[PDB]
């Protein structure tokens, strides 16, 4: 497309000269005024996938932390993605850590960030999602796109459960699934909630609050769940890769005891010490160097959960083959972040063709029969 052409020239200018967070907020602004390209094509019926009743028109979505406040959900989705995870959000708005907090190394296609959950807060983001849901009713191109909401806690909050429950009562009606963020490295002590006993109490409290949404309601299903599924939101949990194997196995059992709807693998890592551009900086590392660690973590959890917990893959997915390794290792869907940063408007259209081609040469009849094949 001609529209894809000029955006790649702008993109190459931005990654060379412009501050990373400025670039990001510029992307978001172009999305806010709806001047990004559209992918209007029908997605291959053979690359469609699902997690329980969530029907993804294609296997690629945008990961959390891209549209933290839900200011341009439509525009990002219309680039060719099947779903987006907005957030992570907190009950109260907060500025996050001191800038600059985002750095890119183009050479290794890697990002490091210490944002610290900068977001406008649950109430404002809830308004934003409601406006999207009203536009979704009236827009032909949005009718099957899924929107999940990643939720966390404010910096100074001590009871994470109090924060999670607040967000659910606010925004749960408008969400297709809820992602519990216990894996951010940039909010002190958050990843300590991954410990098995703590995680279990969190999951059950979240599920309890989602069930109580529908229990003082007087209106029909259609008018309570103002989302895409027309159902209560599923519950996923997003894990960090920096865990040991007995932590992984005890988490794995909590996810089955809780009957959690899915698992997002993985968040950023702190164990990448080999990028010179980054050797003084704070935060969690995204991108290509995170790929091999994520796929490994997927295989381990698919195994330790006896493949009863669907997986959403996150970590260094840039190519159709990258996606296929996530799928063969056990994932049903794939989330993109770094790919967008470094490849631009084209990421969805391109990666969908690559995996479409790759699924045929491998001899898979459709995507779903590739899930967990490495095992
Ligand atoms: C700037 C930035 C902000 C992020 N914010 C969030 C967030 O708010 N919540 C979350 O769960 N993950 C967040 N992430 C992690 C990504 O969603 C994703 O899991 C990670 O970047 C790995 O994907 P990738 O290698 O394809 O980039 C953020 C990542 C970056 C780089
Ligand atoms: C580079 C990038 C993009 C793509 C992008 C941005 C601007 C423009 C244009 F110049 F056209 F405005 C075109 C584009 F393709 C989204 N986000 C980021 C980013 O750096 N995010 C920070 C690292 C975490
Ligand atoms: O907002 C952040 O700082 C953040 C959250 C998260 O979950 N992962 C990440 O890398 N950064």
């Amino acid at each position: 497309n001609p529209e894809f052409f000029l955006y790649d020239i702008f993109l190459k200018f931005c990654l060379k000269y412009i501050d990373g967070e400025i670039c990001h907020d510029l992307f978001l602004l172009l999305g806010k005024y709806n001047i990004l390209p559209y992918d209007t094509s029908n997605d291959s019926i053979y690359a469609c996938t699902n997690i329980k009743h969530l029907d993804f028109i294609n296997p690629f979505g945008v990961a959390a932390g891209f549209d933290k406040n839900g200011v341009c959900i439509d525009s990002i989705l219309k680039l060719g993605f099947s779903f987006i995870e907005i957030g992570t959000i907190t009950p109260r708005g907060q500025t996050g850590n001191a800038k600059p907090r985002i750095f890119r190394d183009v050479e290794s296609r890697s990002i490091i960030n210490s944002c610290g959950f900068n977001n406008m807060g649950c109430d404002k983001v809830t308004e934003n999602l409601i406006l999207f849901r009203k536009r979704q009713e009236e827009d032909k191109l949005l009718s099957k796109h899924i929107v999940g909401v990643s939720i966390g806690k404010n910096k100074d909050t001590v009871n994470i459960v109090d924060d999670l429950k607040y967000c659910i009562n606010k925004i749960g009606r408008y969400a297709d699934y809820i992602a519990i963020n216990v894996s951010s490295p940039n909010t002190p002590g958050l990843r300590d909630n991954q410990e098995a006993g703590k995680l279990k109490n969190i999951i059950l409290s979240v599920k309890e609050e989602i069930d109580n949404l529908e229990k003082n309601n007087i209106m029909n299903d259609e008018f309570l769940w103002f989302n895409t599924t027309k159902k209560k939101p599923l519950v996923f949990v997003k894990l960090a890769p920096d865990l040991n194997q007995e932590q992984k196995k005890e988490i794995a059992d909590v996810l089955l005891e809780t009957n959690i709807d899915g698992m997002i693998i993985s968040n950023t890592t702190t164990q990448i010490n080999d990028i010179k551009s980054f050797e003084n900086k704070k935060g969690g590392v995204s991108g290509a160097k995170l790929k091999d660690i994520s796929t490994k973590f997927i295989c381990e959890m698919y195994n330790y959960t006896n493949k009863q917990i669907p997986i959403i893959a996150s970590g260094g997915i840039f190519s159709g083959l990258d996606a296929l390794e996530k799928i063969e290792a056990g994932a049903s869907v794939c989330q993109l972040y770094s790919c967008l940063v470094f490849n631009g408007m084209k990421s969805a259209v391109q990666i969908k063709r690559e995996l479409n081609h790759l699924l045929y040469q491998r001899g898979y009849y459709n995507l779903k029969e590739a899930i967990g094949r490495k095992h």
Side-chain angles (χ1 to χ4, degrees), residues 62-77:
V62 173
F66 208 97
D67 195 348
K68 287 164 176 292
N69 301 314
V71 298
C72 65
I73 296 155
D74 317 56
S75 298
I76 292 165
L77 285 168

Side-chain angles (χ1 to χ4, degrees), residues 35-87:
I35 56 195
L36 306 192
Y38 289 175
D39 179 6
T40 51
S41 70
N42 286 318
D43 285 316
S44 174
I45 58 178
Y46 303 119
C48 85
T49 182
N50 74 282
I51 282 159
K52 288 178 192 42
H53 67 257
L54 285 166
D55 291 318
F56 301 93
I57 66 180
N58 74 63
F60 296 103
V62 173
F66 208 97
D67 195 348
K68 287 164 176 292
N69 301 314
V71 298
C72 65
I73 296 155
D74 317 56
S75 298
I76 292 165
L77 285 168
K78 284 188 224 143
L79 290 170
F81 294 101
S82 66
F83 71 108
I84 181 166
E85 189 174 308
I86 60 166

Side-chain angles (χ1 to χ4, degrees), residues 68 113-117 181 184-186 267-268:
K68 287 164 176 292
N113 87 86
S114 52
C115 282
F117 283 166
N181 191 331
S184 174
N186 314 316
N267 210 316
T268 48

Side-chain angles (χ1 to χ4, degrees), residues 24 62-66 68 85-89 101-102 109 111-115 117-118 150 179-184 186 238 264-268 284-288 290-291 294 313-318 326 335-339 341:
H24 197 75
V62 173
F66 208 97
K68 287 164 176 292
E85 189 174 308
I86 60 166
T88 302
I89 59 155
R101 51 204 182 184
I102 300 175
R109 314 181 291 164
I111 309 172
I112 179 144
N113 87 86
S114 52
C115 282
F117 283 166
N118 56 297
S150 189
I180 312 174
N181 191 331
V182 287
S183 48
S184 174
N186 314 316
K238 186 171 191 186
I264 304 154
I265 306 170
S266 82
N267 210 316
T268 48
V285 163
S286 298
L290 176 67
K291 185 193 128 205
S294 322
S314 183
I317 301 161
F318 298 79
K326 304 290 173 132
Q335 268 173 355
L336 269 49
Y337 197 122
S338 298
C339 186
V341 171

Side-chain angles (χ1 to χ4, degrees), residues 5 9 28 30 47 52 67 71 89 108 120 207 217 341 360:
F5 182 61
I9 317 284
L28 293 175
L30 299 173
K52 288 178 192 42
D67 195 348
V71 298
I89 59 155
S108 59
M120 297 191 289
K207 296 178 75 71
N217 162 78
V341 171
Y360 200 60

